[PDB]
């Protein structure tokens, strides 16, 4: 059931979590990507990525405040995906699609990998 | 903007955060309401409530792992609102609307107070 639903609720929650990230409020992890640092909320990362879900459900790794990703990872690709996690918007361009796809495969972001493969197949 | 958007992203993030709450994964606060305890994620509470936003942006209160609410607050009303925070769905019924509205006013959940006032005005 006898529920009502607020259509904009989930997107408003995301917008507010992105504002907390922008102001560095309650961020609890630093992700390091080829010497560049990105602050974030562990719960948002886990909710969006198979890799972060595996890391932060691990009894040892859940205690870490700094996570280093493989240095071959493209930090612009990571930044594009982190923005997607917090906004639902993916800035996919001809010049970044290969890097974004590789990063999404590494992060285990299935829907993102799916859309990249579709855009690449349409280009060929 | 040159973005694409994943329609279900924000609701999938909420569904996953609700699954973390159900499994007690990375919950970082206990809310106590008339001797009943509710575990949650501070960031989700802040994103949904003016009261929790004020508490967890305070330099002293942000360190607390237990928050006691006014004991006059109805814990069923709180539980209904916590479920709304994590699902966008509000279980509003004739038998709980007055308690839900009072709790939403206390929590500073403006859109919820708005819909309660509308349903009450339609009933009179």
């Amino acid at each position: 059931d006898s529920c009502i639903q607020f259509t904009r609720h989930a997107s408003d929650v995301l917008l507010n979590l992105n504002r907390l990230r922008s102001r560095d409020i309650l961020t609890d992890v630093v992700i390091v990507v080829s010497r560049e640092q990105f602050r974030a909320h562990k719960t948002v990362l886990m909710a969006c990525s198979g890799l972060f879900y595996s890391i932060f459900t691990d009894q040892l790794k859940c205690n870490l405040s700094v996570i280093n990703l493989d240095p071959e990872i493209n930090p612009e690709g990571f930044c594009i995906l982190l923005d997607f996690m917090y906004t639902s918007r993916l800035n996919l361009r001809e010049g970044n699609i290969m890097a974004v796809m590789a990063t999404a495969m590494y992060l285990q972001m299935e829907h993102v990998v799916d859309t990249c493969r579709k855009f690449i197949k349409a280009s060929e | 903007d040159s973005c694409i958007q994943f329609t279900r992203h924000a609701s999938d993030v909420l569904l996953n955060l609700n699954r973390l709450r159900s499994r007690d994964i990375l919950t970082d606060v206990v809310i106590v309401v008339s001797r009943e305890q509710f575990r949650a994620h501070k960031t989700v509470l802040m994103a949904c409530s003016g009261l929790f936003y004020s508490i967890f942006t305070d330099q002293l209160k942000c360190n607390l792992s237990v928050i006691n609410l006014d004991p006059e607050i109805n814990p069923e009303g709180f539980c209904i609102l916590l479920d709304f925070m994590y699902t966008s769905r509000l279980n509003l019924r004739e038998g709980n609307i007055m308690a839900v509205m009072a709790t939403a006013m206390y929590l500073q959940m403006e859109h919820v107070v708005d819909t309660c006032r509308k349903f009450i005005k339609a009933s009179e």
Binding site: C3, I4, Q5, F6, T7, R8 | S88, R89, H111, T115
Partner: peptide, 5 residues
């Protein structure tokens, strides 16, 4: 907004 889910 409010709708029927």
């Amino acid at each position: 907004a409010w709708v029927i889910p």
